[PDB]
Design an enzyme around this catalytic site. Structure first.
Site, PDB file in Angstrom:
ATOM      1  N   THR A   1      -6.786   4.182   6.608  1.00 20.94           N
ATOM      2  CA  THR A   1      -6.292   3.034   6.180  1.00 20.94           C
ATOM      3  C   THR A   1      -7.157   1.956   7.087  1.00 20.94           C
ATOM      4  O   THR A   1      -6.944   1.714   8.316  1.00 20.94           O
ATOM      5  CB  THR A   1      -4.727   2.472   5.737  1.00 20.94           C
ATOM      6  OG1 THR A   1      -3.772   1.898   6.521  1.00 20.94           O
ATOM      7  CG2 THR A   1      -4.329   3.012   4.634  1.00 20.94           C
TER       8      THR A   1
ATOM      9  N   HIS B   1       5.741   7.035   6.558  1.00 19.83           N
ATOM     10  CA  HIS B   1       5.518   6.565   5.147  1.00 19.83           C
ATOM     11  C   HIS B   1       5.290   7.778   4.280  1.00 19.83           C
ATOM     12  O   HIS B   1       4.458   8.867   5.109  1.00 19.83           O
ATOM     13  CB  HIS B   1       4.828   5.360   5.097  1.00 19.83           C
ATOM     14  CG  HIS B   1       3.001   4.805   5.898  1.00 19.83           C
ATOM     15  ND1 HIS B   1       2.902   5.135   6.854  1.00 19.83           N
ATOM     16  CD2 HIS B   1       2.199   5.833   5.382  1.00 19.83           C
ATOM     17  CE1 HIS B   1       1.706   5.784   6.731  1.00 19.83           C
ATOM     18  NE2 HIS B   1       1.280   6.809   6.069  1.00 19.83           N
TER      19      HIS B   1
ATOM     20  N   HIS C   1       2.091   9.308   1.117  1.00 16.74           N
ATOM     21  CA  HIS C   1       1.111   9.055   0.214  1.00 16.74           C
ATOM     22  C   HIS C   1       1.085  10.271  -0.722  1.00 16.74           C
ATOM     23  O   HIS C   1       1.542  11.660  -0.623  1.00 16.74           O
ATOM     24  CB  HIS C   1      -0.532   9.066   1.071  1.00 16.74           C
ATOM     25  CG  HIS C   1      -0.747   8.703   2.243  1.00 16.74           C
ATOM     26  ND1 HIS C   1      -1.869   7.414   2.141  1.00 16.74           N
ATOM     27  CD2 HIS C   1      -0.163   8.605   3.260  1.00 16.74           C
ATOM     28  CE1 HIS C   1      -1.757   7.151   3.428  1.00 16.74           C
ATOM     29  NE2 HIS C   1      -0.799   7.837   3.931  1.00 16.74           N
TER      30      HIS C   1
ATOM     31  N   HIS D   1       3.410  11.169   6.117  1.00 21.17           N
ATOM     32  CA  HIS D   1       3.123  10.513   8.029  1.00 21.17           C
ATOM     33  C   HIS D   1       4.050   9.957   8.742  1.00 21.17           C
ATOM     34  O   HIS D   1       4.282   8.951   8.490  1.00 21.17           O
ATOM     35  CB  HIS D   1       2.118   9.295   7.743  1.00 21.17           C
ATOM     36  CG  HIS D   1       0.721  10.275   7.048  1.00 21.17           C
ATOM     37  ND1 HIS D   1       0.112   9.487   6.689  1.00 21.17           N
ATOM     38  CD2 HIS D   1       0.040  11.309   6.861  1.00 21.17           C
ATOM     39  CE1 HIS D   1      -1.429  10.040   6.213  1.00 21.17           C
ATOM     40  NE2 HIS D   1      -1.133  11.306   6.313  1.00 21.17           N
TER      41      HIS D   1
ATOM     42  N   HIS E   1       0.792  -1.435   0.481  1.00 20.37           N
ATOM     43  CA  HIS E   1      -0.131   0.066   0.337  1.00 20.37           C
ATOM     44  C   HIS E   1       0.774   1.022   0.231  1.00 20.37           C
ATOM     45  O   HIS E   1       0.781   1.921  -0.460  1.00 20.37           O
ATOM     46  CB  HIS E   1      -1.028   0.335   1.387  1.00 20.37           C
ATOM     47  CG  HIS E   1      -1.552  -0.815   1.913  1.00 20.37           C
ATOM     48  ND1 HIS E   1      -2.251  -1.707   0.488  1.00 20.37           N
ATOM     49  CD2 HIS E   1      -1.396  -2.633   2.525  1.00 20.37           C
ATOM     50  CE1 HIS E   1      -3.430  -2.867   0.772  1.00 20.37           C
ATOM     51  NE2 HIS E   1      -2.516  -3.149   2.373  1.00 20.37           N
TER      52      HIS E   1
END
Ligand SMILES: [Zn+2]
Length: 257
Positions: A196, A91, A93, A116, A61
């Site tokens: 998520t 991580h 996005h 994040h 993801h």
């Protein structure tokens, strides 16, 4: 299994995780005309001096960089928080194009990506237990915009070809997360959730006002990763962001006038 692609994307998540339609979901749009300054808010204290990175991996993801969270090395305190929160991983996005990619928006405006840094409240003993408590997690959110390269990000970019497909992993020591922070620590904060699955409402969000700049070449490397594992059909890891959710009865507070 959930994902971000037409048939298993955010609009479908509620079927497996009914909390998707909860009262404290993330992300949300930050409306500066409605965000109110709160004098009670303490300045953030981010102590990342002895941070110890361990590895980097593609979980299907995003890619996460994991840290040693056995000791109070890399911790966040202050602001709206009550205790000590240990950094466990960070991580991003990001989007398929520079004009989208962030989860949170400011006055409806999207950024190219969002970082994040995930922390968990020490009183709970470990992340697994913290994640289920309303005051269990604190996530520092930082926006990325395209411009000059971020020197502190280069070490991450240079290792990505090594974790191109799902389940791939590599040692990644000596990475210093201080090189990813903006100059100012002015922030907005609100109670929210993981964006998520399992979408638990256990996150205190701290979204920094000042974005960091990264280059096109740096962000292009993100876009070459794969959602898919080895031997499976190619599916570029892009647009791994959840759209803004309703604010409902929450108030976003600002640490700055
Ligand atoms: Zn995230």
């Amino acid at each position: 299994h959930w994902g971000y692609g037409k048939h298993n994307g955010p609009e479908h998540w509620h079927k497996d995780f009914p909390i998707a339609k909860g009262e404290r979901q993330s992300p949300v749009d930050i409306d500066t005309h409605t965000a109110k300054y709160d004098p009670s808010l303490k300045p953030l204290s981010v102590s990342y001096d002895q941070a110890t990175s361990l590895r980097i991996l593609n979980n299907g993801h995003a890619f996460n960089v994991e840290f040693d969270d056995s000791q109070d090395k890399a911790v966040l305190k202050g602001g709206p928080l009550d205790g000590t929160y240990r950094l466990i991983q960070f991580h991003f996005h990001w989007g398929s194009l520079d004009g989208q990619g962030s989860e949170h928006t400011v006055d409806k405006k999207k950024y190219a990506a969002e970082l994040h840094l995930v922390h968990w409240n020490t009183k709970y003993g470990d992340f697994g237990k913290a994640v289920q408590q309303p005051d269990g997690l604190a996530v520092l959110g930082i926006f990325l915009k395209v411009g000059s390269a971020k020197p502190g990000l280069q070490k991450v970019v240079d290792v990505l070809d090594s974790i191109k497909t799902k389940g791939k992993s590599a040692d990644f020591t000596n990475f210093d997360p201080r090189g990813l922070l903006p100059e100012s620590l002015d922030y907005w904060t609100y109670p929210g959730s993981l964006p998520t699955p399992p979408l638990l409402e256990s996150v205190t969000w701290i979204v920094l006002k000042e974005p960091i700049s990264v280059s096109s070449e740096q962000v292009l490397k993100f876009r070459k990763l794969n959602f898919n594992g080895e031997g499976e059909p190619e599916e570029l890891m892009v647009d791994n962001w959840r759209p803004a959710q309703p604010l409902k009865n929450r108030q976003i507070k600002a640490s700055f006038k």
